[PDB]
Write a protein that binds this ligand. Structure first.
Ligand SMILES: [Zn+2]
Ligand SMILES: [Zn+2]
Ligand SMILES: [Zn+2]
Ligand SMILES: [Zn+2]
Lengths: 328, 329
């Protein structure tokens, strides 16, 4: 049957061009070369218990071959890639041009861009504009003054993935977009604040939703954080909303992302005919930030921090002298 | 991010076998070998006016575009018949995919669904609460199930498109009224097709007929133009309330009818659509042309008896009658 779809906001898809080639010498994850992009290892793993990584050498960065250190390495390299991409994002630049830059910076580092052909995703990075919640496909649309853009980078290197994302302003933002982007970052911080040994995974969402409500925003329910490591998506499932069904306790050596998607209107999402792009059902803007982290002996260590710990959108607001919105 | 999904009924995806190859000599549509299965012809066409085909040679089985369409439609009926014959309890939908693929290649045609926008199989096998676009999998068909097989074939530059729902083992009362309502809805829709009729009147008839069996109509998925392209204009909505029919318009009417709510959700595989409430869904489809005088379907059964009816008569099961806007006291 033929599918019909009505758009819920002003955004429309641009043209999508072919996916970029990865140099021969770069090692591929198992879904890279398969038509349809199914990951056999993920299909095999799904449902199984959360992995406990060995963190014996978490704090000896000379131990480069340790699983947890390979995760740290690919995460730090992915931060280099994401900072290149955000620096290039400006009014008049297409998201496909950002895909060129992320793809080339990733392969320059001898890494494979994880999104590329992942279950058939057709580009090397997700670029999500305005009402797009997540999984926007890089296309020929020029970014416009006043837009917000999330770039979600993930890379695969020596058998391990790293994953991170952030939202930045494209030109000077309006008040609602400032409130939304800051709310999304505060929500990431609220979630991470829960992380420590013996915390319950379900508490992450209680904390995020509490924070979101203080900025009059809602929390996306369909999409979640995830374990990441040898696999791109694995357990645990990390729900971002309150009173959720998440089972399980955090333990030292658990590796996962927290990546809340926060909306100015209702929490509900819809999917574009491309089968990937998710937007808000009411067409209002959505923003997201993401870190990969490990539960440590005493707390939590993020591997995907900004170089000075200051998020790029805050640097933009400080440059413009625009104030951070206050909680209610 | 990671996507979560709550299954709405009892069905679950099975394992999905590797992708089948098509013999070297068979002609392929543009999307066949392309990563992601995009079709450039469909992309270039989107928005353009409905194509009027030349019907001068419509009944000249010796003389052509309309006849190429008729041919692939008739051969596609054969394939669907071979496929419905094989559909028994214990048989897997992947086994059926094998049979359709082989039967289609056997006739030197390309199976249209294969790699269509990345669809992994050569045929859609939709079971029970699945509205459409079911992917053939490891699951064995079970006693009491209903199965829709949706066949589309590509041959000499044209697609033909048809589907029907059959029973797997002996059907309960509810599946009986559903499958029959779905078929009756197709007839109701076909019964509006003639020159100068409005495309919108199709859903008027379908929904009216659907009500009479205590059934709702799927709003998200529609009939479509078919021919050079797999999906093209017109868009043919199946529910109540743009364009007018004209001789030489070739399209499908393919009402998807549900026992519960009209609403649909989509599985993580990105294709399989089930009802939101998990209740059962059923569908029938013909390809047709608007003739000089009315309509003509190219995908009819060999004798015009729907396979599900033959199954019912052979099992001796009564056809549920319709039911009853106005009252007087
Ligand atoms: Zn169709
Ligand atoms: Zn990510
Ligand atoms: Zn992630
Ligand atoms: Zn069909």
């Amino acid at each position: 049957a033929m599918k019909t779809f009505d758009f819920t906001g002003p955004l429309r898809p641009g043209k999508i061009t072919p996916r970029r080639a990865v140099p021969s010498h770069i090692l591929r994850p198992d879904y890279a070369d398969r038509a349809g992009g199914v990951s056999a290892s993920e299909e095999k793993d799904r449902g199984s218990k959360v992995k406990v990584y060995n963190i014996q050498f978490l704090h000896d960065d000379s131990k480069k071959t340790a699983e947890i250190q390979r995760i740290k390495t690919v995460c730090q390299l992915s931060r280099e890639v994401l900072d290149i991409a955000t620096a290039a994002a400006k009014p008049g630049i297409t998201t496909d041009e950002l895909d060129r830059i992320v793809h080339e910076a990733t392969v320059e580092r001898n890494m494979y861009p994880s999104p590329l052909n992942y279950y058939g995703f057709p580009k090397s990075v997700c670029t999500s504009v305005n009402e797009v919640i997540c999984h926007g496909i890089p296309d020929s649309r020029e970014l416009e003054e006043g837009d917000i853009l999330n770039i979600d980078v993930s890379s695969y290197l020596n058998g391990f993935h790293g994953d991170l994302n952030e939202t930045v302003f494209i030109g000077r933002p309006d008040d609602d977009s400032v409130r939304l982007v800051h709310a999304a970052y505060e929500c990431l911080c609220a979630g991470i604040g829960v992380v420590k040994p013996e915390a319950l995974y379900k508490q992450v969402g209680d904390a995020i939703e509490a924070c979101a409500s203080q900025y009059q925003c809602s929390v996306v329910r369909t999409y979640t954080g995830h374990g990441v490591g040898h696999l791109f998506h694995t357990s645990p499932t990390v729900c971002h909303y309150a009173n959720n069904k998440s089972l399980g306790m955090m333990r030292p050596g658990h590796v996962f992302t927290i990546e809340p998607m926060i909306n100015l209107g209702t929490w509900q999402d819809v999917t574009w005919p491309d089968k990937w792009t998710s937007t808000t059902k009411d067409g209002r803007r959505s923003a997201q930030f993401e870190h990969t982290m490990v539960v440590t002996n005493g707390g939590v260590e993020i591997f995907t921090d900004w170089v000075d710990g200051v998020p790029t959108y805050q640097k933009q607001l400080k440059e413009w002298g625009i104030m951070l919105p206050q909680r209610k």
